[PDB]
Amino acid sequence: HVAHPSLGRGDGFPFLWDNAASTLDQLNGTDTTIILNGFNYLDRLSMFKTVLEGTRKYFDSFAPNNTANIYWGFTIYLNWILATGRSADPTGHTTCGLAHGDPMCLAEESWWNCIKYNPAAIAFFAAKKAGIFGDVTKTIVLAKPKEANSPYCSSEEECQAAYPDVMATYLDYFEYLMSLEKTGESIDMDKAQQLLWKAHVTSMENSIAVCKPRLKNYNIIERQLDRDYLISLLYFAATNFPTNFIESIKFVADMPHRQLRFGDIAPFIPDMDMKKNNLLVVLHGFYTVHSLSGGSSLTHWRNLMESPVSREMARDMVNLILAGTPVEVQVELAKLGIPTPVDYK
Numbered sequence: 001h002v003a004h005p006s007l008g009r010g011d012g013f014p015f016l017w018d019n020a021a022s023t024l025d026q027l028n029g030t031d032t033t034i035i036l037n038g039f040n041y042l043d044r045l046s047m048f049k050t051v052l053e054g055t056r057k058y059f060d061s062f063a064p065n066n067t068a069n070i071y072w073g074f075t076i077y078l079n080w081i082l083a084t085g086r087s088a089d090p091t092g093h094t095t096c097g098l099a100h101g102d103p104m105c106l107a108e109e110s111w112w113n114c115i116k117y118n119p120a121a122i123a124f125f126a127a128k129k130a131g132i133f134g135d136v137t138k139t140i141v142l143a144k145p146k147e148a149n150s151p152y153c154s155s156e157e158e159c160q161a162a163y164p165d166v167m168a169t170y171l172d173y174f175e176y177l178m179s180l181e182k183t184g185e186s187i188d189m190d191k192a193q194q195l196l197w198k199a200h201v202t203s204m205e206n207s208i209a210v211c212k213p214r215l216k217n218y219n220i221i222e223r224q225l226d227r228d229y230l231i232s233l234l235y236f237a238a239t240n241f242p243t244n245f246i247e248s249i250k251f252v253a254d255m256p257h258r259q260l261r262f263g264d265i266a267p268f269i270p271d272m273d274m275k276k277n278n279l280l281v282v283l284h285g286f287y288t289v290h291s292l293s294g295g296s297s298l299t300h301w302r303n304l305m306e307s308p309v310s311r312e313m314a315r316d317m318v319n320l321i322l323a324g325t326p327v328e329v330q331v332e333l334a335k336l337g338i339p340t341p342v343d344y345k
């Protein structure tokens with residue numbers, strides 16, 4: 001049995017979904033503690049699953065199997081990074097994540113691991129704080145990184161001190177949910193999604209500089225995909241596109257099913273379908289606009305995205321992208337009010 005990049009265990013749910021904890025009580029620990037290994041796939045899966053189960057009651061009415069839940073996004077992406085080998089050690093110094101080593105191990109040296117750690121772990125703490133799992137007396141004990149002054153925080157307090165904006169934004173999301181018990185209001189989806197994206201973006205923006213050196217562990221083609229993906233995410237986030245199960249599967253199904261290498265030129269990669277080849281072109285399109293505008297296109301984009309009408313029009317562009325419809329990013333952005341930059345070097 002191996003994790004499928006888009007289908008997880010086979011029907012979209014993550015590889016080993018049933019094996020992950022639904023509640024804190026199913027985790028390992030000692031009567032006074034909870035043990036979680038942040039460098040293990042299953043424990044990282046449980047950091048997502050427990051929040052998903054914990055928040056299921058707010059989304060249950062809308063779709064079967066907690067699929068309307070907007071926590072799915074980075075949960076589905078956990079499976080994709082596993083399945084494509086992107087959580088493994090790219091340096092050759094350990095066998096962490098490799099088939100002949102510990103396949104569940106997530107490497108410190110992995111760029112994907114580096115950027116996705118906080119949305120699993122810090123978010124978990126924030127849910128704990130907000131009361132999503134209930135009263136928790138036991139202390140959470142996280143496995144420590146081997147690197148000195150590592151980007152990976154290993155306790156609630158250390159996480160909070162290292163990345164205070166990331167903790168505060170995920171807290172705001174979970175507090176908003178809890179508040180729905182305190183008032184009986186039905187959830188405002190647009191608002192819940194906007195809060196969750198704000199935390200996601202704050203995390204990315206908090207980890208871009210610290211994780212950046214890990215990009216050199218990959219060949220130039222895979223490395224530019226990483227960059228293209230992170231910059232693109234910031235544009236997608238501003239549209240408030242849903243991060244539920246259906247949309248997250250759609251996304252991963254368009255992402256490359258293996259690490260890129262020298263010789264891969266999108267949209268002409270012959271072991272990939274049209275949707276994967278197109279998306280790679282699109283992600284690089286966002287990168288190019290961003291880069292040639294010196295980042296100023298993202299400031300303009302976020303200003304324009306203060307309008308709900310614009311966000312809706314921008315989501316229609318994202319849907320076109322995910323279906324594989326060829327779009328030139330610069331042309332679509334211009335249409336939505338973004339000055340097209342040109343190369344001045």
Ligand SMILES: *[C@@H]1O[C@H](CO)[C@@H](O)[C@H](O)[C@H]1NC(C)=O
Nearest residue numbers: 010011012013063064065066
């Ligand atoms: C929930 O998921 C399982 C496995 O994917 C499936 O067999 C079942 O039909 C789903 N339940 C509903 C209510 O759709």
